[PDB]
Amino acid sequence: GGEQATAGEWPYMVALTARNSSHVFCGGSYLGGRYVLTAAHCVDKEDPAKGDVLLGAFDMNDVNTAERIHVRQIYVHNSYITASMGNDIAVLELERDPLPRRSVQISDSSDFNELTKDSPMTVIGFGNRPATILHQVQVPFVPLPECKTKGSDQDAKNNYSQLTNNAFCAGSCSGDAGGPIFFDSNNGRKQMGVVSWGGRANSPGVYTNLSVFNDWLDDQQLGLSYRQKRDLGVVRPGSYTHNLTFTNNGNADINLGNTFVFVVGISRTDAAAIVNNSCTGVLASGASCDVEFSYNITEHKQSYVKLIIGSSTYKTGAVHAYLYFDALDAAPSETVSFLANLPVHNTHVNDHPWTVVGNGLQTSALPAGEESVILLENLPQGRLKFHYKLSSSEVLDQLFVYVNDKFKGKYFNNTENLATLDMYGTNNKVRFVYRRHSGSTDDQSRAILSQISYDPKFFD
């Protein structure tokens, strides 16, 4: 019961696209001014200039009728880790003012409480994550305690059972990820949620609970403009500086108090400090300031330099900023030679490196509680094939494989077999992480990869 929508019914629909391209990757909504609301999982750590917005998206074969605007910055909730854990919310600051256009009204707690079991709600979208023309479909509200019991296998049941009140559920296509869900509150139409995760039976949609983010949402729209998340990718351990510019694109003063900067982790040798800060006090409409910091990365890990600046003007009390990094050393020549039959851009390793032993790449001797890491950075789409062999008396000594930061395989101690990973996607990263567990008592715990190949086709 998905009906095509009529132009004009939802002028605040937004579609997200790669810059100047006409292919929708996520949905969204217009909050007014220069701001669009979407899901964090749609945009987290992306370069904003890579993206466009189509306001009033309707027909994707006539995108002239929508207004294309470049994105200037992305703001993601400071608690967001993944869609299942919640806080799946983000705001995009557009480069310029849109043509006058109606904006969505955001739900507040009192509106949310009107919701009861089977209250109909409306979802709109093109069905991304399909339809060239916008559809709308009605769905029933499902209370969190019931939603939490959904699923028939570990993966879903675990995802559903871990839900919190930063999210809510409605009974199940049509919406895009990041897209809006509405309820007619008698106080009028309100956007209640954002499509976050989840024709399967008993698998309701999960949506970000916007009634619990009104303060964060208002803060983001005050107009402070800066690059909140920058991913540096792979970095060598060493000493660096970085500069961040803040601009007030709002109409009112924004007060900025004290400042913290630090590398996230437990290392005592990692460090960060302010080297220059012109943003203290009161930043004024149209004005800019800068924060420069030094940072020292010594532990090989995937972390981020965090900056926090307090603000009395902000209801949530502070401004967050991030510089993500994956600290690893370059694979030496022997290893690059070993992998030369792959079309890989770059190979990297941690401090307990995989190195060539005989016909195989093998984990370095590693202490309990540590891991041996190798990263294959920038492979084209296709399949990676390999043989693996793990040997440890400890059952929690295991090999974990990620493709583009998504977990894709686990391999158990004392087992050997051929495996294949599909790398969909234009540009791919494959990370091998052998974890010797905290309690592992086998000092010989190891893994070996051999027969490693790239196949550009996906069968046979």
Author numbering: 35 to 163, 173 to 215, 221 to 246, 250 to 511
Article excerpt on this structure:
The type II secretion system (T2SS) is a conserved transport pathway responsible for the secretion of a range of virulence factors by many pathogens, including Vibrio cholerae. In addition to cholera toxin, the T2SS in V. cholerae is responsible for the secretion of biofilm matrix proteins, chitin-binding and -degrading proteins, lipases, hemagglutinin/protease (HAP), a collagenase, and the serine proteases VesA, VesB, and VesC. Although many bacteria use the T2SS to support secretion of proteases, VesC is one of three unique trypsin-like serine proteases found in V. cholerae, other Vibrio species, and related marine species, including Aeromonas hydrophila, and may have a nonspecific and perhaps toxic activity inside the cell compared to other T2SS-secreted proteases. Analysis of VesC variants and the X-ray crystallographic structure of wild-type VesC suggested that all mutations lead to loss of VesC production and/or function.
Optimized crystals that diffracted to 2.2-Å resolution were produced from the construct pro-VesC containing residues 23 to 522, which includes the propeptide but not the N-terminal signal peptide or the C-terminal GlyGly-CTERM motif. The overall structure of VesC revealed that it consists of three domains: an N-terminal domain with a protease fold, the middle domain with an Ig-like domain, and the C-terminal domain with a β-sandwich fold. Well-defined electron density maps allowed the fitting of all three domains, the protease fold (35 to 272), the Ig-like fold (273 to 380), and the C-terminal domain (381 to 511), with the exception of the N-terminal residues (23–34), including the propeptide and C-terminal tail residues (512 to 522), due to their flexibility in the crystal structure. The structural comparison of the protease domain of VesC (VesCPD) with typical trypsins showed a high degree of structural similarity, with the best hit found in VesBPD. Consistent with the structures of VesBPD and other trypsinogens, VesCPD displays a similar positioning of its catalytic residues, and the three disordered loop regions (residues 164 to 172, 216 to 220, and 247 to 249) in the position of the active site are also observed in the crystal structure of VesCPD. In contrast, two loop regions, residues 115 to 121 and 194 to 208, in VesCPD adopt substantially different conformations, which extend upwards from the globular body of the protease domain. In the crystal structure, the interface between VesCPD and VesCIg buries a 1,568-Å2 solvent-accessible surface, which is ∼28% larger than the interface between the homologous domains in VesB. The structure of the third C-terminal domain of VesC, which is missing in VesB, revealed a concave β-sandwich domain. The high degree of structural similarity between VesCCBM and CBM family proteins suggests that VesC binds to carbohydrates and/or target glycosylated substrates.
